[PDB]
Design a protein around this ligand. Structure first.
Ligand SMILES: CC(=O)N[C@@H]1[C@@H](O[C@H](C)C(=O)O)[C@H](O)[C@@H](CO)O[C@H]1O
Ligand SMILES: CC(=O)N[C@@H]1[C@@H](O[C@H](C)C(=O)O)[C@H](O)[C@@H](CO)O[C@H]1O
Lengths: 277, 277
């Protein structure tokens, strides 16, 4: 009856709710209209949800995803229309609203996302009131795996952390200098590439230089994004993968810059299903 | 009868030298194999110079251009071979060697490029011995117009330099945030876009925040790139447009980083032309 989604830049999880229960859970690759034309978006969409759904018809469909700026929301909604059957109108918004509906539900509060990309907001109870548009992983997205990987590759190959870690990194993923620039500048979804090579940071987090890179990235995010809200009486609900597995470094950078924190979960799906019933 | 060129990712100049003089000069847009396949680069080459190029059949031909790393040198080298007719063997290199031959000729010294992109090297007298390969404007290129433009836009729309400069920037180039993000993530040659909006820094240099942003970008460049060379007895020949019109901030950052300075040219061609005959 209802279909729920949350499209990250690298992956997408889909949920099917009927009479308030979960009758199906789906995974797909990431969809961002700034990395995917509607053909790629849609032909992928053909290959995705439809095969694992006995019935392709619904009454309500709610799709939240990265790159879903208002200028691109109708584009993505028409992509989903040419593949689904819903009795009412399709809602299409950003992943921030999914995170907010998941964390706070019908109540207000601050919500931030740290995964493939980064983002920060204040939320009313039914809609996002304010938002720092993150500009992406080239002009912002500070503190997220794609940016972490961007920083790490840059620092390593500028000989800023020595040869040992540089060689362990380039050997662990069997990459030459050419692979990076080809993968980042000429190959689809370079943010996936960066966010995927970024867990090397977690692997060698005991090194001060790597721990400091992660900490200073978290610092810059909080400074340039979360500080723009009333962070002195609001418990920032953090959602995302980077924020979950780097919990300690995030709490480090938060106590440094005075940013407050509340509940920190990795995926909004279980909080989203609670909201819809 | 020889032709020498130097194509930055934004522009390209071609020269045909006979009788010790320059007998003809044509200009075309920039070609970079990481934002243009070599055919597309090439499909313009038909449109620009050849229609006017009286003879495409001459002796030696030597082409230097950005993004033209060893992994990419042969592809571009055959593209010029399958239309062009040159009597001797093909030279293919990066813009750094043109800058070095122009700046240093047959003598050594440190040579740096500051325009659309960044790069760093020490040069012997026939070829570059050491180099910090800049990885481009997404993983490095610190101190370059695209990176300067990247930083300024990022800071502005995250409200890090106020509303006055942010608004003056967005109305003066008649850009909205979505247009920005569309131009950087979906539009060809985003490095030109950033480097073209970057002169806003020089225009508003009286603001402390912008002067410090430009200076600190220059600082880290010297730090992460030039410091990797012998900067204590070598007078760094800086080459480029950014380096000429931001001369004072560069000398500031040079006294800041103890780094020495030499010659500042924006374009190398007559020094390149001086080298050949
Ligand atoms: C241009 C781009 O990719 N933005 C995305 C965001 O998308 C919304 C629509 C936005 O741009 O504001 C997304 O919420 C965050 C977290 O996933 O990462 C950013 O990179
Ligand atoms: C990935 C990329 O585009 N790098 C280019 C450089 O190209 C060389 C070959 C290199 O990549 O090492 C170029 O020298 C400088 C200055 O123009 O700008 C960078 O952006």
């Amino acid at each position: 009856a209802i279909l729920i989604a949350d499209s990250g830049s690298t992956k997408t999880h889909w949920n099917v709710l009927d009479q308030g229960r979960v009758i199906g859970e789906i995974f797909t690759k990431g969809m961002n209209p700034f990395f995917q034309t509607p053909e790629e978006m849609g032909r992928e969409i053909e290959r995705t949800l439809l095969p694992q759904l006995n019935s392709n018809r619904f009454c309500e469909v709610h799709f939240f995803g990265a790159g879903c700026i208002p200028e691109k929301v109708p584009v993505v909604r028409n992509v989903l229309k040419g593949c689904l059957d819903v009795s009412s109108l399709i809602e299409v918004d950003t992943d921030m609203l999914a995170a907010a509906k998941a964390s706070c539900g019908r109540s207000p509060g601050i919500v931030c996302i740290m995964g493939t990309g980064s983002n920060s907001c204040f939320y009313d109870g039914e809609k996002i009131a304010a938002n720092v548009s993150p500009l992406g992983f080239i002009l912002g997205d500070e503190g997220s795996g794609a940016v972490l990987g961007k920083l790490l590759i840059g620092d390593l190959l500028k000989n800023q952390m020595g040869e040992e870690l540089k060689e362990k990194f380039l050997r662990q993923y069997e990459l030459t200098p050419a692979n990076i620039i080809e993968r980042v500048y000429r190959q689809p979804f370079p943010n996936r590439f960066l966010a995927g090579i970024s867990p090397f940071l977690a692997e060698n987090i005991e090194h001060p230089a790597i721990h400091s890179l992660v900490l200073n990235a978290f610092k810059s995010f909080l400074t340039r994004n979360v500080m723009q809200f009333d962070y002195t009486r609001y418990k920032a609900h953090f959602i995302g993968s980077v924020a979950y597995y780097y919990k300690d470094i995030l709490e480090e950078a938060a106590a440094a810059t005075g940013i407050r924190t509340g509940t920190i979960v990795r995926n909004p799906m279980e909080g989203l299903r609670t909201y819809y019933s």
